[PDB]
C-alpha cells in the first residue's frame, strides 16, 4: 500500500516518484483537494521514444507553415518552421541568436487528427489517468456540453529553444499566466544544443545548480540518468490578485503604464525574473515555488494556478487539459458542466 512520494517547495507540490504505481491517484486526490500541484516523474518511460523526438516531429509535420515567436518580445519572427527545427540543436543555424518558440503546433482537434499516433501514445501514457485521461472516472472533460469549457479544450504541442545561447535569463519561454482548466504538462523531449560557443550540457547543469533550489531538487540534479530541461516558477491561485497588483505597480515605475486597468496576467506579457520575484516576496509575501522539469516529468496544475517557464535546453512539451478515471464523481463535471457554459 506504499505510494512512493515526497514534497517539494515547502510542502506545496506533491512529487509522485513512480509513474508505474497504479495507486498514485489515491495520494494525489488528497493533495489536489488542497490545491497542491503534483509532479509525476518517469512518464517518458511509458511513452514511445520515437514519436516524441525533435527529428521525428520535424520530419512528420515540417511541411505545415506556422508563425514562430521570438520569446523576448513576442513578435512573430521571419523564421519558418524548417529554419526553426534546423536551429533546435544547432545554434549556428539560428537567426546574437534569438529564442524561438513554435507554440500550440499542432493543437486541439488538429493534434488529434493530424498526429493521431502521438495522440494515441499521449492517451496511453498520461499519468493519474483517473484524473487526466478522457475516460477517467474523475474527469469531466469529455462530458460537459460546449458552453462551460474553454473552446480550445484539447492537447497542445509546444517546442522552443532554451535561453542559454542568448545569455538572457530575463526571457521566458512561457510568460506568467493563469490556467483556465486543470492541465498536465509533460516534458517529452530535451535537445542539447551545440555551436556558437553555447555553454555545454555540464555548464548548463551548473547553471541549474546556481538557482535557489529545494534540497530535494539538488539531489535529483546529482543523478546523471535524469536530464533537466526547463525551469518553472509556480504560484498559488490565491495569490493572483496580489501578483497582478505588483506587476501593475512595476509597470507604472517603468513607462508601459499608459493604459488604465490593464491586466498583466491576462496580457501574458511578463516573465518575472529573479530580481522581480525577490521584490514580490518582500512587498507581498507571495512565495515562488521553483521546480526543475526533467525529461519525463508531468507537472499537474489545478485551474487558477499561475506559472511561467524558462527552457534551458531546447524542449518539447505536450499539454493536456487533463482528464480523469476513477471519480465518476469529481472531475467528470469539470467537463460535464464545462463543455457546457
Amino acid at each position: 500500500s506504499m505510494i512512493p512520494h515526497s514534497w517539494i517547495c515547502e510542502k506545496h507540490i506533491l512529487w509522485l516518484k513512480d509513474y508505474k504505481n497504479s495507486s498514485n491517484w489515491k495520494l494525489f486526490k488528497e493533495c489536489w483537494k488542497q490545491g497542491q500541484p503534483a509532479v509525476v516523474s518517469g512518464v517518458h518511460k511509458k511513452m514511445n521514444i520515437s514519436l516524441w523526438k525533435a527529428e521525428s516531429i520535424s520530419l512528420d509535420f515540417g511541411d505545415h507553415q506556422a508563425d514562430l515567436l521570438n520569446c523576448k518580445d513576442s513578435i512573430i519572427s521571419n523564421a519558418n518552421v524548417k529554419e526553426f527545427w534546423d536551429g533546435f540543436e544547432e545554434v549556428s543555424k539560428r537567426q546574437e541568436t534569438v529564442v524561438l518558440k513554435l507554440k500550440d503546433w499542432p493543437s486541439g482537434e488538429d493534434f488529434k487528427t493530424m498526429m493521431p499516433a502521438r495522440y494515441e501514445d499521449l492517451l496511453k501514457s498520461l499519468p493519474l489517468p483517473e484524473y487526466c485521461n478522457p475516460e477517467g472516472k474523475f474527469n469531466l472533460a469529455s462530458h460537459l456540453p460546449g458552453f462551460f469549457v474553454r473552446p480550445d479544450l484539447g492537447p497542445r504541442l509546444c517546442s522552443a529553444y532554451g535561453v542559454v545561447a542568448a545569455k538572457d535569463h530575463d526571457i521566458g519561454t512561457t510568460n506568467l499566466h493563469i490556467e483556465v482548466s486543470d492541465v498536465v504538462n509533460i516534458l517529452v523531449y530535451v535537445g542539447i544544443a551545440k555551436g556558437n560557443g553555447i555553454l555545454s550540457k555540464a555548464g548548463i547543469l551548473k547553471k541549474f545548480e546556481e538557482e535557489d533550489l529545494d534540497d530535494i531538487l539538488r539531489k535529483r540534479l546529482k543523478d546523471s540518468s535524469e536530464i533537466p530541461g526547463a525551469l518553472w516558477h509556480i504560484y498559488a491561485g490565491k495569490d493572483v490578485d496580489k501578483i497582478r497588483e505588483f506587476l501593475q505597480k512595476i509597470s507604472k515605475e517603468q513607462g508601459l503604464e499608459v493604459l488604465p486597468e490593464h491586466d498583466p496576467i491576462r496580457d501574458q506579457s511578463w516573465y518575472v525574473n529573479k530580481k522581480l520575484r525577490q521584490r514580490l516576496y518582500e512587498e507581498y509575501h507571495v512565495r515562488t515555488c521553483t521546480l526543475i522539469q526533467f525529461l519525463g516529468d508531468a507537472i499537474v496544475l489545478p485551474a487558477g494556478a499561475l506559472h511561467q517557464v524558462q527552457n534551458f535546453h531546447s524542449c518539447i512539451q505536450v499539454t493536456e487539459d487533463f482528464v480523469s478515471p476513477e471519480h465518476l464523481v469529481e472531475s467528470f463535471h469539470l467537463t460535464q458542466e464545462l463543455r457546457l457554459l
Side-chain angles (χ1 to χ4, degrees), residues 21-28 30-32 35-52 54 56-64 66-92 94 97-193 195-205 207-218 220-221 223 225-241 243:
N21 187 306
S22 57
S23 293
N24 283 344
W25 67 269
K26 296 180 188 182
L27 180 52
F28 170 75
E30 299 304 308
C31 302
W32 191 236
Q36 292 186 351
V39 191
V40 182
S41 53
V43 173
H44 63 305
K45 298 157 166 183
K46 184 59 170 178
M47 296 181 110
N48 185 333
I49 16 61
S50 72
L51 291 181
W52 298 103
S56 82
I57 289 164
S58 170
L59 178 65
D60 288 348
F61 216 58
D63 290 342
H64 303 99
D67 297 321
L68 287 298
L69 271 170
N70 179 325
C71 293
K72 173 99 200 145
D73 57 17
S74 294
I75 297 172
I76 297 164
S77 169
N78 298 342
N80 56 37
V81 169
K82 166 101 195 321
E83 287 158 347
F84 169 79
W85 284 116
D86 284 349
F88 202 69
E89 295 165 19
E90 290 288 338
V91 176
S92 74
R94 296 177 186 179
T97 61
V98 301
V99 183
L100 294 180
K101 180 160 172 182
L102 183 50
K103 179 171 183 179
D104 302 341
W105 198 248
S107 71
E109 301 302 311
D110 281 357
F111 185 121
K112 293 178 195 179
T113 72
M114 298 298 300
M115 290 186 154
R118 290 178 180 99
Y119 185 53
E120 171 195 59
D121 199 49
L122 170 71
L123 294 185
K124 149 161 190 219
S125 304
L126 289 156
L128 299 162
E130 297 73 16
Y131 277 94
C132 303
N133 182 287
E135 292 196 9
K137 200 181 167 205
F138 328 102
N139 191 6
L140 327 150
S142 303
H143 302 288
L144 301 174
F147 153 72
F148 286 104
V149 275
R150 61 193 300 168
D152 57 348
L153 198 304
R156 294 183 277 282
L157 191 67
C158 284
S159 308
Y161 295 173
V163 301
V164 169
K167 308 184 85 172
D168 184 355
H169 286 259
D170 283 352
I171 297 173
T173 48
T174 302
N175 285 343
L176 181 75
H177 71 284
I178 192 168
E179 309 293 354
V180 164
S181 70
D182 307 323
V183 62
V184 55
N185 305 76
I186 311 176
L187 176 53
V188 298
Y189 178 83
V190 180
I192 310 309
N196 273 19
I198 192 185
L199 209 68
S200 71
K201 170 179 172 169
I204 293 177
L205 170 63
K207 186 83 191 195
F208 278 117
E209 286 169 346
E210 293 159 1
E211 297 289 340
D212 200 11
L213 307 176
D214 265 15
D215 277 339
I216 318 287
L217 272 180
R218 314 197 156 275
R220 258 195 103 176
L221 214 44
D223 186 337
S225 72
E226 220 76 306
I227 302 114
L231 180 67
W232 285 58
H233 296 105
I234 296 164
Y235 294 92
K238 66 110 149 58
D239 293 337
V240 58
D241 291 338
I243 291 162

